[PDB]
From a paper:
The severe acute respiratory syndrome coronavirus 2 (SARS-CoV-2) viral RNA-dependent RNA polymerase (RdRp), crucial for the replication and transcription of this positive-sense single-stranded RNA virus, is a promising drug target for the treatment of COVID-19 (1). Nucleoside analogs, including remdesivir, sofosubivir, and favipiravir (T-705), have been shown to have a broad spectrum of activity against viral polymerases, and are being trialed against SARS-CoV-2 infections. The suggested modes of action of favipiravir, a purine nucleic acid analogue derived from pyrazine carboxamide (6-fluoro-3-hydroxy-2-pyrazinecarboxamide), against coronaviruses comprises nonobligate chain termination, slowed RNA synthesis, and mutagenesis of the viral genome. Here we report the structure of the SARS-CoV-2 RdRp, comprising subunits nsp7, nsp8, and nsp12, in complex with template:primer double-stranded RNA (dsRNA) and favipiravir ribonucleoside triphosphate (favipiravir-RTP), determined by cryoEM at 2.5 Å resolution.
To investigate the structural basis of this activity, we determined the structure of the nsp7–nsp8–nsp12 SARS-CoV-2 RdRp complex, in the presence of template:primer RNA and favipiravir-RTP, by cryoEM. The overall structure of the polymerase complex observed, comprising one nsp12, one nsp7, two nsp8 subunits, and a template:primer RNA, is nearly identical to those previously described. We resolved and modeled some additional density in the N-terminal nidovirus RdRp-associated nucleotidyltransferase (NiRAN) domain of nsp12, including a pyrophosphate and a Mg2+ ion. We found that favipiravir and two catalytic Mg2+ ions are present at the catalytic site of the complex. Favipiravir is stacked onto the 3′ nucleotide of the primer strand, and forms a noncanonical base pair, through its amide group, with the displayed cytosine in the template RNA strand, consistent with favipiravir mimicking a guanosine base. The density is most consistent with the inhibitor binding noncovalently to the polymerase, with little to no covalent incorporation. Neither the phosphates nor the magnesium ions appear to be coordinated by side chains from the polymerase catalytic site, indicating a mostly “open” conformation of the catalytic site. In contrast, the current structure indicates that favipiravir-RTP is bound at the open RdRp catalytic site in a nonproductive configuration. In addition to base pairing with cytosine from the template strand, favipiravir is coordinated by Lys545 in the F1 domain of nsp12, which is positioned to accept hydrogen bonds from the nitrogen atom in the pyrazine ring or donate to the fluorine atom of the inhibitor, although, in both instances, the distances are long (3.4 Å and 3.7 Å, respectively), suggesting possible water-mediated contacts. The 2′ hydroxyl of the favipiravir nucleotide analogue forms a hydrogen bond to residue Asn691 of nsp12.
Residue numbers in the entry:
A (entry chain A): 4 to 895, 911 to 929
B (entry chain D): 84 to 111
C (entry chain C): 2 to 68
D (entry chain B): 78 to 191
Write the structure that this text describes.
RNA sequence: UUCAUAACUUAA
RNA sequence: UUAAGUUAU
């Protein structure tokens, strides 16, 4: 036994403590990226073919360097001889020693690798793409092995939470230099394979955490100088880790050395096209697909997603001041102006306006409107601003003083409160008590709420996985009608709303719609097809009842942005709201049996059904820019016949510069919005629905690809998993045959009912237990690496019995109620929410007797189903509202407000 | 503003709290 | 009784809004904190001690209300 | 007709804020560019003659605007006046660790380019 | 200072 | 169709 250990030591003199007992194989759980004729996926397997040998340094202390012996077949042993000999000169190849030891009577081949770390690059990727708190020993061991954090750092509660513990980003960033060194080693390894004429597939499990490669059992020798390394699955799986660990941080320093100071970039520099190309060639040299630094040169929406993904990573190196609107000097009437003639996007690269006039005789109303909405005119004339309250980029201060608007406490209705107390309410020991109030805020609320955008981080997505997901997501929206419409076909819900900055200083939205003729609106819409119009978004505090001390803010887009967006999206948005029985239930009424129909649709054909629901933490703030761009591309797929390739790009660029990374007009000062979604955007609810479906599909893809193929008993599912890996990482073109099959698979086992952010899923319970479909655990993992948030399981829910509906959907509970001769599902809210609305109002004018009676009828309609609740205290809430209606009429078809059968008709199946 | 002030004092007298009653008499 | 202190807290902060209390940042910042704590309070021990403290702010400046 | 009133008001707004634009500083910035196209985020950084600093607490005041003068954006700034959250004039000597609780934070600091 | 979308009720 | 109000995101 000692002789075998001596031969493992080899020529190098290093102490090697054994891991096995009798020089036998070692069994560990490791993540492997595997694809063969049987099994295809990225999951953990059993590695029982190696015999690790931990190295003992001076003073007998253990170090991070292992000796592994694989002892494969004799035929494979000779194959590794030729490949290693052609690659021993490459510094990126781990040292190999070949020897044969007499374990048995006969000669036994052995292959030994020297100085390998405990974990590979696949272990790091899997630990972060399949994160699970508690069961995260591998990630913790990796973090402390490379001095990212101390062993006691995990004693702190919620150490992994991005929101609760923002310092976790600093710990993860300590792995950036190690990851960047691995990227450089891979390029060196690929060059050696290409020069030696070696063809093979590079996988993460074959690369050490030091960047060394040690597996050559699947390489085929060819003519030297014509080697073809395959790095589709390698780079694509590693992409979310590049921005999580901030691998390219060293590129910001001089000579890419962290010790040296930062590069002093020229302050006027904005192009950075050559720098992006150099970065791509340095780290992604063998990425086969063409990369366009500027997305204006892309071929289709799929190419935009591919190229914008690389721009997200590369934009983290360039100075923040180089992004945003690009301005120049133009001469009109002899008076020079500063206007925006372009835009430098962090994702779309540099975009230049086409219709630019250096000299103009006069301004028509169309261009007069455009110049006013331009942030260039306002920001140039403002003063320099340095705000230390928030980490968001500050552009300028338009006003000589900072606004400190506050939130007033809500008004009280003493008449209703006395009546409720007189009727036996608000007593101690009762299950119904006030929990919703109009919480007050101080003068720092407006800027403190805006600072929540710090949760938005540059996220680089798995591009091969994302490109397949958008095909499945687009299937959910194939039953809709979309396209551009004329100005006279636009329907405006309310013209008495704010027109946004700076247009709110002269009139409401009614003034501008009346001032511009249909020709002017159409001309402005055609202008956005060739030019980018940056706008300014105003931030206002939301004065509404809530159960949380959190301040609410609403973003108000300018009239220029919302007018052109309506002509581009309203046809599709109206079609979505007018469709019944689809996955997206926006526009479906909950009255007249609509709630029952919605629940029956989601219960369609699931054989072993359980109900599941979740919520997105900081959804409007932590949404990655890649997913927001993806949502716009899906909505723009209905313009295949009305818009050209360039027209669709500029429309996307306009949205990215208006509701994604636009200027923010908060408290008299201009700021830069890192990303997320704007509440006041015309497509906010529908864009969030696309984002919701994408995460659900991504969770299902990850769940199926992370399960053991051998353990799957169903032949159809195993074949489905094998083709799923094949479509993501082996085919660059869309396989519509498989997209339909996967979409049909999701509709059968993962039927879901989705609104903007709330979602209810009726999934196959048996499949979920085997990992065949997504579950709560898969959603948490997806949100960790693709959304930069941690979703606690306490915030989600699971329902086992379908007799009672979803536990929580759109702030409504569900119960089965008999109605005449059949059982139906009726939505009822929290009794505290209903009572709080009546007790507290937001205006003293609303306290008037005439206004309350109309106000109380609507509340009684919502509170009517509470009468069917088994709890007697819940049922009395509607009776109290009914009785209060008598008193209002006492002191003031009319009788229809009581005799509650009027409210019965609001929930009967017939309309 | 007279109506709002006079109704608030009714609630304070209705609460019947020793600490609340102590300060209101001290200020009176 | 527990509902009454939150009931009285809302109106007590409301009357200070038009008394130009928010004109001073120091007074409004602590008044808002006291008022919000009563609404989120769950135990009756601490519910009163913000109630008496917040009312004392109104009596601090007599000019507002003629007692 | 509303066609003209909004046109006049919006045209006035464009012309009424040329005080800090087309000045001597802004001309130099454009010429150095190889095409005359520059990012918007750098114009206030190199052309504005007045800077506003919002200081939330005394700890940040020492590290940002200590003394009567300080440097920012590769330029020298001279502190002119300091006001509190109530827009009241605050003397420079009043800012201290002991007097910090008596100050109506945040503090707004106005400076002029040297 | 007070956004977007959807449903519903009320009154003309 | 216009106005107002409520709930919903
Ligand atoms: N413009 C508005 O007036 C507006 N109002 C809202 F309440 C919500 N949104 C949008 O929906 C998202 C999730 O809303 P969200 O915060 O989840 O709502 P909620 O707190 O009522 O939900 P829940 O009861 O399930 O917790 C918001 O981040 C925003 O994108 C709005 O645009
Ligand atoms: Mg291997
Ligand atoms: Mg949410
Ligand atoms: Mg929600
Ligand atoms: Zn491209
Ligand atoms: Zn179109």
């Amino acid at each position: 036994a000692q002789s075998f250990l001596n031969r493992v030591c080899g020529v190098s003199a290093a102490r090697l403590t054994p891991c096995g007992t009798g020089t036998s194989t070692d069994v560990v759980y490791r993540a492997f990226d595997i694809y063969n004729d049987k099994v295809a996926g990225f999951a953990k397997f059993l590695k029982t073919n190696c015999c690790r040998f931990q190295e003992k340094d001076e003073d007998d202390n253990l170090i991070d360097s292992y000796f592994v012996v694989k002892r494969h077949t004799f035929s494979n042993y000779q194959h590794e001889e030729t490949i290693y000999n052609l690659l021993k000169d490459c510094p990126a190849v781990a040292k190999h020693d070949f020897f044969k030891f007499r374990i048995d009577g006969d000669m036994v081949p052995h292959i030994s690798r020297q100085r390998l770390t405990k974990y590979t690059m696949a272990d790091l990727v899997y630990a972060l793409r399949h994160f699970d708190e508690g069961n995260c020993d591998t990630l913790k061991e990796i973090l402390v092995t490379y001095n990212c954090c101390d062993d006691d750092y995990f004693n702190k509660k919620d150490w992994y939470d991005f929101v609760e513990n923002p310092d976790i980003l600093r710990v993860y960033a300590n792995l950036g230099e190690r990851v960047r060194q691995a990227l450089l080693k891979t390029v060196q390894f690929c060059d050696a394979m290409r020069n030696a004429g070696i063809v093979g597939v590079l996988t993460l499990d074959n690369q050490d955490l030091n960047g060394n490669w040690y597996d050559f059992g699947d390489f085929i020798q060819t003519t030297p100088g014509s080697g073809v390394p395959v790095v589709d699955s390698y780079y694509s799986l590693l992409m979310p880790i590049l921005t999580l660990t901030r691998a390219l941080t060293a590129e910001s320093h001089v000579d890419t050395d962290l010790t040296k100071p930062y590069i002093k970039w020229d302050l006027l520099k904005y192009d950075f096209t050559e720098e992006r190309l150099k970065l791509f060639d340095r780290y992604f040299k063998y990425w086969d697909q063409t990369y366009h630094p500027n997305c204006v040169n892309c071929l289709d929406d799929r190419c935009i997603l591919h190229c914008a993904n690389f721009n997200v990573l590369f934009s983290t190196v360039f100075p923040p001041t180089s992004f945003g609107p690009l301005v120049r000097k133009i001469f009109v009437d002899g008076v020079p102006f500063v206007v925006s003639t372009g835009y430098h996007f962090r994702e779309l690269g540099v975009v230049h306006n086409q219709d630019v006039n250096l000299h103009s005789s006069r301004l028509s109303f169309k261009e007069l409107l455009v110049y006013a909405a331009d942030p260039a005119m306002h920001a140039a004339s403002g003063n320099l601003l340095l705000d230390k309250r928030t980490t968001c980029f500050s552009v300028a201060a338009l006003t000589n003083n900072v606004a400190f608007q506050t939130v007033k406490p809500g008004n009280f209705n003493k008449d209703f409160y006395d009546f409720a107390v007189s009727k036996g309410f608000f007593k101690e020991g009762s299950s119904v008590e006030l929990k919703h109030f109009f919480f007050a805020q101080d003068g720092n609320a407006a800027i403190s709420d805006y600072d929540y955008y710090r949760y938005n981080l540059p996220t680089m997505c798995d591009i091969r996985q994302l490109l397949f997901v958008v095909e499945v997501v687009d299937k959910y929206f194939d039953c809709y009608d979309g396209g551009c419409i004329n100005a006279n076909q636009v329907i405006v819900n309310n013209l008495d709303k704010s027109a946004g900055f700076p247009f709110n200083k002269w009139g409401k939205a009614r003034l501008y719609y009346d001032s511009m003729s249909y020709e002017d609106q159409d001309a402005l819409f055609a202008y956005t097809k060739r030019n980018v119009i940056p706008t300014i978004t105003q931030m206002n505090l939301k004065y509404a009842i809530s159960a949380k001390n959190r301040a609410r803010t609403v973003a108000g887009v300018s009239i220029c942005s919302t007018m052109t967006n309506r002509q581009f999206h309203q046809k599709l948005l109206k079609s979505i709201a007018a469709t019944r029985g689809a996955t997206v239930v926006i526009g479906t009424s909950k009255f007249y049996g609509g709630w029952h129909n919605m629940l029956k649709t989601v219960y369609s054909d699931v054989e072993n059904p359980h109900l599941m629901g979740w919520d997105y933490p900081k959804c409007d703030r932590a949404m990655p820019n890649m997913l927001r761009i993806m949502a716009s591309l899906v909505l723009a797929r209905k313009h295949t016949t009305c818009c050209s390739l360039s027209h669709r790009f500029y429309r996307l660029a306009n949205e990215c510069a208006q509701v994604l990374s636009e200027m923010v007009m908060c408290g008299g000062s201009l700021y830069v919005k890192p990303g997320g979604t704007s509440s006041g955007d015309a497509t906010t609810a529908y864009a969030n629905s696309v984002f919701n479906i994408c995460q659900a599909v991504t969770a299902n893809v990850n769940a199926l690809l992370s399960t053991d193929g051998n353990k799957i008993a169903d032949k159809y599912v195993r074949n489905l998993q094998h083709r799923l890996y094949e479509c993501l990482y082996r085919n660059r073109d869309v396989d519509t045959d498989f997209v339909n099959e996967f979409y049909a698979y999701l509709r059968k086992h993962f039927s879901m009912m989705i609104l903007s952010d709330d979602a209810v899923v009726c999934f196959n319970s048996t499949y979920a237990s085997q990992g065949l479909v997504a579950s709560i655990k898969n959603f948490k993992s997806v949100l960790y690496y693709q959304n930069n948030v941690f979703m606690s399981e306490a915030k989600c829910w699971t329902e086992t019995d379908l007799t009672k509906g979803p536990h929580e959907f759109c702030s409504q509970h569900t119960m089965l109620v008999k109605q005449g001769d059949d059982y139906v599902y009726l939505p009822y809210p929290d009794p505290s929410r209903i009572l709080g609305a009546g007790c507290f109002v937001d205006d003293i004018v609303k306290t008037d007797g005439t206004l309350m009676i109309e106000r109380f009828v609507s509340l009684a309609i919502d509170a009517y189903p509470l009468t069917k609740h088994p709890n007697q205290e819940y049922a009395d809430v509607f009776h109290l509202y009914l009785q209060y209606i008598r008193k209002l009429h006492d002191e003031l078809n009319t009788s229809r407000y009581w005799e509650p059968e009027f409210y019965e008709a609001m929930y009967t199946p017939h309309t | 503003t007279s109506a709002m002030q006079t109704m608030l004092f009714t609630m304070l007298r209705k609460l019947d709290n020793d600490a609340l009653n102590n300060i209101i008499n001290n200020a009176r | 009784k527990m509902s009454d202190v939150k009931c009285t807290s809302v109106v007590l902060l409301s009357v200070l809004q038009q008394l130009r209390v928010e004109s001073s940042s120091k007074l409004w910042a602590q008044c808002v904190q006291l008022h919000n704590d009563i609404l989120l309070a769950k135990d009756t021990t601490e519910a009163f001690e913000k109630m008496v403290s917040l009312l004392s702010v109104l009596l601090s400046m007599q000019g507002a209300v003629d007692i | 007709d509303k066609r003209a009133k909004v046109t006049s008001a919006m045209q006035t707004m464009l012309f009424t804020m040329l005080r800090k634009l087309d000045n001597d500083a802004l001309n130099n910035i454009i010429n150095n560019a190889r095409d005359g196209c520059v990012p918007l985020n750098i114009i206030p950084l190199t052309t504005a003659a007045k800077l506003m600093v919002v200081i939330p607490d005394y700890n940040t005041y020492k590290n940002t605007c200590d003394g009567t003068t300080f440097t920012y954006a590769s330029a020298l700034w001279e502190i002119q006046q300091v006001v509190d959250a109530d827009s009241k004039i605050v003397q420079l000597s009043e800012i201290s660790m002991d007097n910090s609780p008596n100050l109506a934070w945040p503090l707004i600091v106005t400076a002029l380019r040297a």
